[model samples]
Target: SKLSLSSDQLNHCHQALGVFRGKIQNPDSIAHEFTGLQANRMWPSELLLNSTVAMNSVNVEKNRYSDVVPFDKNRIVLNPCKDSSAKGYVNASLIKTSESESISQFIATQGPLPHTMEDFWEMVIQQHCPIIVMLTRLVDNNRTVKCGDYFQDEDGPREFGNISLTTKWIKTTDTSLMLRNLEVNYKETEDQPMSVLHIQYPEWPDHGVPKDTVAVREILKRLYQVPPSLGPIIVHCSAGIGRTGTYCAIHNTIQRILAGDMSALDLAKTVALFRKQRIGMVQTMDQYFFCYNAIVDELEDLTAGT
Candidate 1:
């Protein structure tokens, strides 16, 4: 369907668009806006006293970092584990863009740890997720490990815990993206195998925005055909809240904008709503600004097509 905004929404979006364009010119103002967002954010203390399940002694090792745990209320609970040690725990949060299921939903999570790779695929299979948007590299430029090698780099089946992972094919879709088709099977279950599309974008540096919005927005364009009914798309970076959060905000807002929803124009409010579900979304001021740049760029392209 074609995107349309009402007379009022057009003016509203244009007003916000002008503000976005102006702030992009004076990026310091973008930083100021992010500071305002931080000042008024729903800090974890105010949202939930503790992520008890994530902090439990049994589940402690599953988390990539001590500080970046998921709040229990919105965290994804995997199917009950035969291994009592599992406790069905995964460091992933169900991020809702709206109360209704019409818009895209996401699982914001950390890059999988080697130990958690099985749980990662289990989350994917259990959630029926069609696409995975990975926004960080397995290793960074400094030779630091950012994410565990969760998938097969070649066309071979490898076992992870109770799951079997086979990479059917891998291709470089773009300079910034490496596309892989994965088939994951849960050894304990006797169901048919499932296909998962894994889109890995390694260019986005931790705690920083990409150099331009081109590759970032290209991601949104590629995911346009995914039916929301398929399931929440799994998105993660090193921390999951920075690049993952920023990408979610852009995707959610643009989808709403395309559907003629006025809330699409408010980047700050969109981020605040995201943080309400998972603490510390849009981790950096630059990342927060990247949301605006990406959204505005897509809107401009849409308007041009009209």
Candidate 2:
């Protein structure tokens, strides 16, 4: 069934988004703390300077897509095959950190290119990642390259180099998000194919914040149904830094709040932590402010009845 945004839901969004109009800040002014807040934390300038070293150390040229870069310490290293010509290289990173005082991990990556689509699947299987949360559409305005057409269902299963992917089912959640249950099978294998869930939040725009945080919160709630024992969930947007970082920050902070600690509510510190793992997290101050707003929104809903 098609998920519809109810009028009351839209009203809440309208009001919440309306509150943000006067709160938007100059991207340059949000260096310390969140854009619209008082007394938020600061990202250490020394650590930030050292963090920039990854650009020089990591081989960005190895990436299939030109703009996608991975931090040196956390970049995913694929074991090269017997026919391997290129060394260990993939534009993805193992973004693991403490959330609510417990370690949580995820692969924050760019939308794979046509050539690297197989590499993407390989990493999923290699890492035992069960969930992929995508935050962009393939094309927007009919000409823009928002992301690559990496998987399929209605058009049937598609093979990228060595891996064959078949979509088992796709569902539209009542809160207006899309989900696809996909199966990844390696060629020449009789073994069972690995199951992967592809969750798409198509409403989020590149380098921009969502008009409302409801859908994003709905995603966080939906993902909670997954057992934590499962491997790190893969999250990506076009660049995999901006919206990806925002989602990760929200997930981490919300977990802390639920764990009875409100100190994790600081969005600035959350972004700073992610940037340490992967450069340029929560890309814009606008997106930075949105993280705080989204956290507030989720907390409101979580505490509404209590």
Candidate 3:
């Protein structure tokens, strides 16, 4: 029922981490697990559901990639879009951690297109999203634009349709992460303005994990205090599933473990559960392996100071 794990939960998770570590210490076992995931990647769609809105011609321009679309079942429905041709569609999905009140949900979404910028803000404001975890840079090392410049980088305010987002401050951590605090105001509503935290980790390669887990874990460390009730944390990568899904799996697993759920230690099952919510949660073998590495690193750290 809580957003973060308690000390009792951490102690319990630390004990379970030792057993899980022993099981995954061998490289071959990890690789085999990844292969199993790859072999069953499409199993989530075996029931023949349709991503009708995402694939609709009227909304094609809203999605970054055709292959990566949000399912109609759990996709976030924005307020009525300004474009009459479109019907509240965004390339985003609501993913849950567990089945009970202990569940933590996050919005896994695509990097916004220039035209979809307003839709992104609409989702943020409409959902009361407290955080935006961006895993890719606007421009990658190859000079390819990965995400649109959706918010004001400076202290100036930028208007996205009727929504105005103003960056309040920007800070960079020693771990090479960028944090931006912004305030959002809606033109039509009398509701109080909303604050949003935008965190970006840009060095993660297209299909690869980071060289280490420090940066990614730092994100979880910063988010430990955020109340789960505050709306879904909007997370996005290029297509929204690869890095986005991997982070969700790690975050969800850690929180569940902290809550004393021993079953949270199953990395394979965690990813499979995520795929059911949003197709292709963890994209590649490397990212999946990185999830294990990151979780193991965090568990060791959590247990160390005790």
Tell me the TM-score of each prediction against the true structure. 0.89, 0.78, 0.92
Off by over 4 Å in 1: 1-19, 22-29, 41-48, 83-86, 99-101, 153-155
> lDDT of each prediction vs. the true structure?
0.82, 0.69, 0.83
lDDT of 3 by residue, 125-156 (tens): 88999999999988888898999999754546
Q: Residues 1-306, candidate 1: write the lDDT tens digits.
A: 244456655655565566667767887877877899889866545433668888788888988777788887889988776566655889999998665555889999999999888888888888999899999998888898989989865545788877898887888865568889888887877887899889988789998989999888887888877888889999999888999999999889877765557776667788888887777889988788788889889767655533
Q: Pick by lDDT: which candidate is best?
A: 3
For candidate 2, report its TM-score.
0.78
**lDDT of candidate 2 over 117-236, digit per residue (tens):** 777888888888989999988876556787788877577679877889998888897667888899998898978999988889887878888999988988787776666567888999
Evaluation by TM-score, superior candidate among 1 and 3: 3
Alpha-carbon RMSD, each predicted model: 3.0, 7.1, 2.8
Candidate 1 local lDDT, residue 244: 94
Best by TM-score: 3
